[PDB]
């Protein structure tokens, strides 16, 4: 209220707790600190009542900068699709943080495992890409490998496979890291890092399948009340999309084909998680042929997953060596084919 | 001109992996309340409790952590 640049007014101190009592704050003081005097016309007040406690959310966005605030900072959704997409985007970010803190630096002594990497600066080849394991994980790896060597070597000629071959090495190490963990949150984080297939991903896929079975039943009922393909479940979304475009509002029909493989993909992914869990439980001594095929397919997939960052690095390094080569066209000395002519031109020679 | 010929000689971009690496060395808190005070947007989230303790971060924008 009419403040000067240099002049200040000194005011009394209410109590010994200072502006912010470090010792603590009582319930009514916290209630006042929560329900601060904001202009209500721009504040959302919200509750959530559950078993033991209430949760309150009071959020205010000033009228000043609704034209400049980034769409993410405001997080305002003026539509239903905007609302859902913001809900799920923020949910993804929050879950990412909450689950990465379980295996990050804080982590736990037996959970957090690091990777050692070394790449040549001239031949651009990975001379080291391994995991830093403890004794328990190394002993699990040794048990796995010695058990498989006792039979895979006798059964396999190894004419081209080699004698020192590591059988299902990627599956073995991806299972060893999980085996060495001591917390379910960390084990699930490592699962998600391994081709997803963690508990939450599989539950979301189950939710999608359970929502699609209802639609398949709905389309079956509609067709009966008013020839079908072998596995109708995978086409139910497209069928309902067209039925709604025909009868209902349906301002749009669907063409997303990504859902057709879903039944088989989900069955295979669940098979994969079950196989990984049994290998963690050490029950790899007895394997059916379906499980052996599952392991063969999964091992090849996990071996490419861990090399994404290394391939990014290899690409970046390839760009560098590209910029270091001679300018212009190839010098006359380091050139084999003639310039200005295709090497296969029938008039190759003069 | 004369004759007609029939020559005898006669799926993509799907996000099937969604793989995320979650390794963060940040600090995570048990919070009975957050008060995020910027100059513009103010957020106040609180759980019921009998007595509280207060931390305050003025690093970038004001954040009062009640725990």
């Amino acid at each position: 209220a009419r403040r000067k640049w240099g002049q200040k007014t000194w005011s009394p101190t209410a109590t010994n707790g200072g502006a912010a009592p470090a010792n603590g704050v009582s319930a009514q003081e916290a209630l006042q600190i929560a329900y601060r005097p904001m202009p209500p016309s721009q504040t959302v007040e919200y509750e959530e009542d559950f078993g033991h406690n209430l949760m309150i959310h009071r959020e205010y966005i000033s009228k000043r900068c609704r034209d400049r605030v980034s769409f993410e900072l405001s997080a305002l959704s003026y539509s239903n699709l905007e609302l859902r997409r913001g809900q799920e985007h923020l949910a993804g970010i929050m879950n990412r943080e909450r689950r990465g803190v379980s295996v990050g630096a804080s982590g736990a002594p037996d959970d957090q495992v690091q990777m050692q990497t070394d790449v040549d600066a001239n031949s651009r080849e990975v001379l080291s890409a391994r995991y830093l394991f403890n004794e328990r994980r190394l002993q699990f790896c040794d048990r796995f490998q010695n058990f498989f060597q006792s039979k895979l070597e006798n059964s396999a000629a190894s004419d081209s496979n080699g004698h020192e071959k590591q059988h299902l090495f990627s599956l073995m190490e991806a299972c060893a890291v999980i085996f060495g963990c001591e917390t379910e949150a960390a084990r699930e984080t490592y699962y998600r890092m391994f081709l997803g297939l963690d508990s939450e991903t599989l539950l979301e896929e189950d939710e999608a399948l359970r929502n699609r079975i209802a639609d398949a039943k709905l389309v079956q009922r509609v067709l009966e009340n008013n020839n079908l393909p072998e596995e109708f479940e995978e086409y139910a979304p497209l069928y309902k999309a067209y039925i709604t475009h025909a009868v209902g509002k349906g301002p749009v029909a669907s063409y997303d084909i990504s859902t057709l493989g879903s039944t088989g993909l989900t069955a295979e992914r669940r098979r994969w998680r079950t196989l990984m869990e049994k290998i963690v439980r050490e029950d790899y001594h007895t394997m059916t042929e379906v499980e052996q095929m599952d392991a063969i397919v999964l091992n090849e997939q996990l071996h490419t997953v861990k090399f994404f960052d290394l391939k990014i690095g290899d690409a970046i390094r390839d760009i560098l060596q590209l910029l270091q080569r001679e300018t212009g066209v190839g010098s006359s000395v380091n050139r084999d084919t003639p310039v200005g002519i295709s090497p296969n031109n029938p008039e190759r020679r003069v | 001109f004369l004759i007609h010929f029939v020559h005898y000689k006669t799926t993509f971009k799907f996000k099937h992996i969604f793989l995320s690496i979650d390794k963060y060395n940040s600090l995570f808190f048990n919070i009975s309340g957050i008060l995020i005070w910027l100059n513009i947007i103010h957020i106040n989230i609180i759980l019921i409790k009998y007595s509280f303790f207060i931390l305050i971060n003025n690093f970038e924008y004001l954040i009062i952590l009640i725990s």
């Binding site: 209410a14 502006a19 912010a20 | -």
Partner: peptide, 9 residues
């Protein structure tokens, strides 16, 4: 009614 609650003195 402290400073945090009452944003003034």
């Amino acid at each position: 009614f402290l400073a945090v609650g009452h944003p003034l003195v």
